[PDB]
C-alpha cells in the first residue's frame, strides 16, 4: 500500500520479513515509471505508530504555540 | 517540544528560522549524556502534518489488517 501526505512524500506500507513495513519517506520517480523513497524519511514502528497518534494531541498543540 | 513516540525516537516540534517544523527523528545519546538527533528522520511541516493525521484513517486500516 502507498499513501500520500504531501507532494513527493508517500507512505510505504507492505509486508517485510516478518513485520509490517511502514515507511514515511520522500518518493522519487524511477527511470522506468515507478516511485520509490529517497533519504528524508522515517519508518513508523508498530509500537511507535500508537505512541505517535497519542502524542499528536500534544504535538499539534506545540505547533500552535510557535 | 520533545515528544517521545518510542525508543530512541522523539518528535521535536521546533521553529526553524520562522518555520514550525515537526521533525520526527531519532536521538542517540552522546558520550556526554545528551541525546543528539540522528541522520534518519523526516521534518514534516504543519501542512503535511495535517495530512498525516487525516491519512491515519487509511494507514491504520492497513496496519490493523495483518
Amino acid at each position: 500500500a502507498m499513501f500520500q501526505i504531501g507532494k513527493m512524500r508517500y507512505v510505504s506500507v507492505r509486508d517485510f520479513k516478518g513485520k509490517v513495513l511502514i515507511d514515511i519517506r520522500e518518493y522519487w520517480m524511477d527511470p522506468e515509471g515507478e516511485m520509490k523513497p529517497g533519504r528524508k524519511g522515517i519508518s513508523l514502528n508498530p509500537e511507535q505508530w500508537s505512541q505517535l497518534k497519542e502524542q499528536i494531541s500534544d504535538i499539534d498543540d506545540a505547533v500552535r504555540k510557535l | 517540544a520533545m515528544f517521545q513516540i518510542g525508543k530512541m525516537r522523539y518528535v521535536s516540534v521546533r521553529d526553524f528560522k520562522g518555520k514550525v517544523l515537526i521533525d520526527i527523528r531519532e536521538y542517540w545519546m552522546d558520550p556526554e549524556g545528551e541525546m543528539k538527533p540522528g541522520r534518519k528522520g523526516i521534518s514534516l511541516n504543519p501542512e503535511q502534518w495535517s495530512q498525516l493525521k487525516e491519512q491515519i484513517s487509511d494507514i491504520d486500516d492497513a496496519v490493523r489488517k495483518l
Partner: peptide
C-alpha cells in the same frame, strides 16, 4: 525498476532499526 529495486534493498536497513527497536522493551 532501476530505482525501484535499489530503494528496496535498503528497506531492511531501517526495518531492523526503526521498525525493530520498540518491541525490544516497553
Amino acid at each position: 525498476y532501476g530505482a525501484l529495486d535499489m530503494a528496496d534493498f535498503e528497506f531492511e536497513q531501517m526495518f531492523t532499526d526503526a521498525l525493530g527497536i520498540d518491541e525490544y522493551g516497553g
